[PDB]
Design an enzyme around this catalytic site. Structure first.
Site, PDB file in Angstrom:
ATOM      1  CE1 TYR A   1      -3.387   3.018   0.742  1.00 16.89           C
ATOM      2  CE2 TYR A   1      -1.891   3.545   2.477  1.00 16.89           C
ATOM      3  CZ  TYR A   1      -2.964   3.767   1.618  1.00 16.89           C
ATOM      4  OH  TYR A   1      -3.456   5.154   1.824  1.00 16.89           O
TER       5      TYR A   1
ATOM      6  CG  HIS B   1      -2.310  15.585  -3.621  1.00 17.24           C
ATOM      7  ND1 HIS B   1      -3.409  14.649  -4.223  1.00 17.24           N
ATOM      8  CD2 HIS B   1      -2.384  14.772  -2.338  1.00 17.24           C
ATOM      9  CE1 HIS B   1      -3.543  13.827  -3.625  1.00 17.24           C
ATOM     10  NE2 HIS B   1      -3.157  13.543  -2.560  1.00 17.24           N
TER      11      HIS B   1
ATOM     12  CG  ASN C   1       1.939  11.729   3.059  1.00 19.00           C
ATOM     13  OD1 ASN C   1       1.403  10.943   3.736  1.00 19.00           O
ATOM     14  ND2 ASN C   1       1.186  11.779   1.811  1.00 19.00           N
TER      15      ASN C   1
ATOM     16  NE  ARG D   1       8.690  46.131  42.285  1.00 18.59           N
ATOM     17  CZ  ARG D   1       7.729  45.825  42.969  1.00 18.59           C
ATOM     18  NH1 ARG D   1       7.775  44.506  43.676  1.00 18.59           N
ATOM     19  NH2 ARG D   1       6.742  46.485  43.111  1.00 18.59           N
TER      20      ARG D   1
END
Lengths: 506, 506, 506, 506
Positions: free
Chosen positions: B53, B83, B192, B280
């Site tokens: 895969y 994409h 990715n 301060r």
């Protein structure tokens, strides 16, 4: 429970125990020297008619005037009385005890110029389980809440004992005390500091930790319930990224899950369906949360031991100096940090619930129930989890970024750490409700895989729940089950399954 | 600028340099083995007609089908084209270079199964100073922005060179490249990852650091301008609290301020007026910010070297595994963390400005101007700083707590790290404007202490400003002065005054 | 474009036209009386050696001193110069024109004591299309931005003409003007007011309206694409609830959708699957948004005509009074109100996109593409929409709840209306991107219902898109399609389909 | 308390009375027709073996199946039982009564197909003062909370009576009822709707209104205490702006303040010091808040009468239609709207407190106390007000912009209106605490103007307080005074001073 305190050395685990249960403590003998020496330094200043601000002076107009001894003593009472201007609900005894022990720890470090006998009084109150009334709101980060606590020392305010309110004087006698009179700098020593802020965030921390632990167990059950894969937890993936939180998180999943289970083994070949992110990215999302709560714990761990009042007495050099340690900015950020972790733990869990409701995702009946034509099953429970997860987003808004000027422009920037810390408790109740529902759902779904068992530790999580809540056979009054599950989690029922040394205080 | 890259070893200082200026890089010879070995592992799978895969399969319907080689190759182009669905403004070259170098670093670690020659192409583009077009928005944490970058590799999209847009093919030739064809897993390897998310947060980090450094210098000048005390920075105060950020911060103030100055010495006895918190509590507030940005830097430092694509190739074992490293949750939290620091640095600074405007506080003329009956002086500049400080509170709202489900419920939880990171740039512009105004005001106020000098390093901060902006004599067009001051800070004019080793990347 | 202005009577539609395109305006003759009378009232005060604050006095020290005439005149320049302390990007000409016309409108109402000739100068600049430089940030709600605008009147600053920056003097000549000298109260008349705040929110309003209109059209297409029902829009449902926004919204859907379409008719019996909330609750969700933007429009409509400077001249009575009209609190709330509408319009749309990606929901191919084994189709576009929708949640954080004290505690509460207004522009770009993607997806999905037509108006929405963007046949570079769709919406391509009289300015 | 209900006609004032105290109600005879007719329409469908979704069908699988009558009846119980999945604290009786009366009102409009006898049962419970247990959380906007309420109808759950929990059956008998069996559509009729959401926001509304009213009185006292001017409230200023809220607000100030007072008259010539914005911009800031709560009230007023369940029965036409009225988006926005008003009312008040603490501003002793060298006076009370004001900024974050998908993607967009509404109660407690402190401070300061009186109505505000809290002579325990003041406000002690017809429900 004996605790012999070496001031400034409390650990996070000690702090969780003080928070969780009554304590018996005593100061270590090695604390006396520096404590008695800051008093002596204060006594010397006064004996030498030296003027020191915050030691023997009055305020503003008299900030350089050596207030007569007589008015000096009554100035301490007036400070405490006038400063006890808090409001809202009473803190519970657990949180009051933590604050008291934090104050003791800080004063006992010997920089505050307060008498050991005053410190001993606070200790007497802890040991006696007499908890002064402290109201929830007022500090901008902790004069008001610390002033309410100190009232009881003077015989004012009230205190809880055996869960009932007592007058201060009644309270003091329970602890074998009589009302005290405060000396130079003592009023300030008691009222200045970040102990309430720190206490509020610490409780948030411990909640965040309990929830992390629960979520590893529930997420492991959910993985099993929908026949998810163990591949996402492979150590090689996490080492290749390099994120420590995620590496530790994944190790936790592997420990709880194991290499395989009867459940996983009986879902033979098929591993052709990649798991959704709410399962597969658990190491990445829960690891980020782990890192985030470790960052906060470090800050809060240090602050639990901080010398936080003002001005500070440096007996060794003879110096008294006014600084800004009472400013709880780091506590405020730590709390806002923890907010992110509690919300994302709950968000990831709610999506796991959501997945479980989806028969196209779950490989289970829709909404986890047999014959859903006439049964709604877990459908509305899921809605509850969405409502709770949702609330956490607004609650996530940081408090550390707000400030208003106080004391006529002299305290022109403040931390808002008490608000930052206490919103965490409600965020944690939301995420706890979400996880309880996940817990219920994953045991239901595993149930439906008739006779099959998951791993050793996850089976203990199933038995833990099933001893209070039965399998969901057909529609019944749902809320009592969720109530039950929530109380189980709040009692730490799943915490013990997590491996040791992962979480800062555990 | 030669960089010989040992993949996975970039330091924060190296990352700041890549971000700030062009790079020349080469892979270290020791990177070849693991890179060539993941390719070989991919090649073996295919040669053995093994199905994997994300390696040799198609998607969804075909997620278990060994897509024919022919469609395998065109599947890579189609992935990149489809994409590349980002939108909004073009990233600037600096940020595009960082992303490219981050991608190179990650692929070069040898877990991605991508050819060295593809990696070499990206390197060729960096070296040639050819920066592919990448639009600002679209990632939920970085398929779209990484897909836009990769377009150019295939001869699609466009790229910038010498500040002009070129066609991809024109661009490629500039780098001495021809369009490539991608192989199995390469499309995914490129698309990715968390490189854009990481790049966005890193820029936020470097901005946060520049501002910290500037604020120590400006706050030191402000202290001097209103005759503040050096006592709050006494090491004993900070050691007694135990907070590391604050201890380091105070050390920075002491270095810049010194034990005394002509200014401080000439304000003889009086030290009877405690300084307001905005002076301060600078160690406490700026220290909290320092701790916060150190926490983020650690996460981002690790992530800059992370193996972040999916699925991962483990040549050593022969395994390919799908995990969740592309989930940028830790980056998202780190950015939300940085938001808190940039806002509080600006908030503390604006209150210092405010103080300076108040003649009851400042011991200076109201609004820092001579004859204010007819001159408004710095009054409206202060308003600008309040507007800018204010904006940061809403901008502080965390993005890491939001998520929407994508990919038809398969990516059901995402990080929103790109939004988290990029809002930091605007927060930093706000805080930069605030500090510029503080800078201007403190030099004006010191000016009014006729002939007096502050410390060595703070005098350099005064000369830095005065070489661009003159003393404010009487009302004049104000905005150009602020503009000038802002550009000075953006150019790092004060960064060099801070001691070495304080800030993660400096 | 002739506009003959009756001061205080601008309508929202007039305001949208000024915002959208150049104007030619003239004051109505009926404006002269009150304008000349406030000047005369000012002239009388001065002629009678009366002292009036903000009229003939100096400031602070001299706030009761009748500053000599000579210094009175130079005090006006010094106010404008010193107040021009804004920063950030230049406003675009469109927004600068709106602010100028708003200032003209307010001064022209005759309460400001400013000479008609100064007003006429501003008008000359509008008519000439000469737009003074105004920077984006600085106001806390609008001294800085109005001071930058007024610089040009005095021959300072710069202005844009035919898109190029000109010197003020060059600019003035283009408009047939010479530099002016300001008189008593004129400086304040010009600098005090809420015109920039109002202008920023109005642009947000008009954007919110364009998006509402687009969303009705896109949501109608999406309904058709997935064979949704028209039953949710039945008037009886909306009348029974009683909410006006929702009643009007549903009427819009019915108009665009009609009773039936070829598409709807050809999906015969089945109406057995209730539509998801993202379709079915469109009247309820979009109606709430409509109500919300109507509430804001009312406030902003009034404020566009407000007398907003200070102090006010009441010639009729002879009185001059200092009040707080320059405080833009109502504008700030209106903007925060609009934020909610822009975000929920985008959120509802993104879920409609999401639905369309789900073949179990859509009755379409997954991700709207043929042969998705090797084609990703709209999958990453959906991700872009989620990223954009997500960003709007943090952006929704209200600015109207923050304030910092300015002017040395004298302006101790301010509105932060400029920040509130301008964040709306980016929220609108996000929601615009979301809708563009919905637009693309619904036309793609309808496409897949081979040969079928939807309603008359929705078919025009399909042709509008298809003339720029083709059916998605197989994977191709996606971002250019989205870019195209976004520009179409930004150009108002779908606005005209909405029925008349629904939206405040349309 | 007799109420004869004409369904759908409740007014906001009626709603405030139901919320504030027990009710006795009866349906008007004119309600019977439409109520009996929707039942008959349902009965006809069933008698004609017609299938209607949500009427005589089962769910999902059976969503088109005419479930046998027998299972039809038990499906109603199972829906209620399974839907009762709420969690968190029990609502108080007041809020439970409002929800019950809202449900009665909506069902009684005749669109729900529920039997009059079921409606009569709910009425019997109201009249008997028997309030079913309803837990605070779970709805995403109100199945869970309405399901908990309905449990009691069936003899399940529990209910409160005379402040004690009773079993449902015990409870029912108190009301003279026996457990019922539900018929077709009744389960849905009872569980669908926005009554809890609406109830939560209404309480927020009424709180917001009480606080507005209090703030006019306290701000008037503060104006007097520091010798402020009445000029900012001149009607001419407010008419010239045109904002209605502000015009009404200023009218309220003039009514309470009057043209002059002994106090104001005795501060002769001097009016040379312009008042700070926290006094002078009260009309503008409080008017914006008034407008905002009027916008919300309108929406909530309508929603209190809405037909909100699903599907709807249209007896007149014979039709049953499924729509989205149960989506409480408008309620959610109204609540987020109210958040802005409660926060800004408290913010403006805290700055008025702040002013009062500043002797350079107040013309009073620092911190409102005689001999402050040794007395801290109101200094820490001011801090409390800052802490409370601050908390409201984060609480202001809108809930209406969040949503998560539920019911397996079928309820893919929800409102989050219950969270939006209930956060308002805590915001109101914060602002109430702030105002109580303002109240205390202004009476203290006026006290210091020995013997002088303010106006008639403001003198009543002084006597109201002084009857519980004494002048602050010297430091004493502060918190009890604040507690007292808060209870006075919560009891509406100052509400009655405001003129009639200003506030929506008063």
């Amino acid at each position: 429970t004996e605790l012999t305190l070496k001031p400034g050395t409390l650990t996070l685990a000690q702090l969780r125990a003080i928070h969780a249960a009554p304590v018996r403590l005593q100061l270590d003998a090695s604390a006396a020297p520096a404590i008695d020496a800051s008093v002596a330094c204060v006594e010397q200043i006064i004996a030498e008619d030296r003027t020191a601000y915050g030691i023997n002076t009055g305020f503003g107009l008299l900030a350089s005037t050596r207030i007569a001894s007589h008015d000096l003593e009554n100035l301490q009472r007036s400070l405490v009385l006038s400063h006890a201007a808090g409001i809202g609900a009473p803190l519970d005894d657990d949180l009051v005890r933590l604050i008291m022990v934090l104050k003791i720890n800080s004063l006992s470090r010997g920089f505050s110029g307060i008498r050991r006998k005053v410190i001993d009084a606070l200790i007497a109150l802890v040991n006696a389980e007499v908890y002064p009334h402290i109201p929830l709101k007022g500090s901008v980060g902790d004069l008001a809440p610390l002033a309410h606590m100190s009232l009881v020392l003077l015989g004012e305010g009230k205190a809880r004992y055996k869960g009932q309110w007592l007058s201060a004087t009644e309270a003091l006698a329970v602890a074998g005390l009589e009302p005290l009179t405060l000396a130079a700098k003592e009023g300030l020593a008691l009222l200045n500091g970040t102990q309430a802020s720190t206490a509020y965030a610490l409780r948030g921390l411990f909640y965040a930790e309990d929830l992390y632990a629960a979520a590893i167990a529930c997420g492991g059950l959910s993985v099993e319930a929908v026949l998810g894969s163990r591949s996402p937890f492979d150590a090689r993936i996490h080492e290749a990224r390099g994120q420590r939180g995620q590496i530790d998180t994944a190790a936790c999943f592997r420990d709880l899950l194991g290499d395989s289970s009867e459940v996983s083994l009986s879902h033979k070949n098929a591993d052709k369906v990649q798991d959704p992110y709410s399962l597969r990215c658990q190491p990445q999302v829960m690891g980020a949360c782990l890192t985030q709560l470790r960052q906060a714990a470090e800050v809060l761990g240090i602050e639990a031991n901080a010398v936080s009042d003002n001005p500070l007495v440096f007996a060794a050099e003879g110096d008294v100096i006014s600084g800004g340690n009472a400013h709880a900015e780091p506590v405020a950020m730590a709390a806002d940090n923890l907010a992110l972790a509690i919300a994302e733990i709950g968000s990831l869990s709610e999506r796991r619930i959501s997945l479980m409701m989806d028969k196209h995702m779950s490989q289970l009946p829709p909404f986890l129930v047999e014959n859903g034509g006439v049964n709604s099953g877990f459908m509305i429970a899921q809605v509850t989890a969405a409502a709770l997860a949702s609330e956490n987003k607004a609650l996530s808004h940081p408090h550390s970024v707000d400030s208003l000027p106080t004391s006529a422009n002299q305290e022109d920037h403040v931390s808002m750490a008490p608000a930052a810390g206490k919103r965490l408790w409600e965020m944690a109740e939301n995420t706890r409700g979400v996880l309880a529902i996940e817990w219920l759902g994953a045991c239901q779904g595993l149930d439906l895989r008739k006779g099959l068992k998951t791993s050793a530790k996850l089976e203990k999580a199933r038995q833990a729940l099933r001893s209070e809540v039965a399998h969901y056979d057909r529609d019944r009054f749902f809320a009592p089950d969720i109530e039950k599950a929530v109380e189980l989690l709040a009692k730490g029922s799943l915490t013990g399954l997590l491996p040791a040394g992962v979480l800062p205080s555990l």
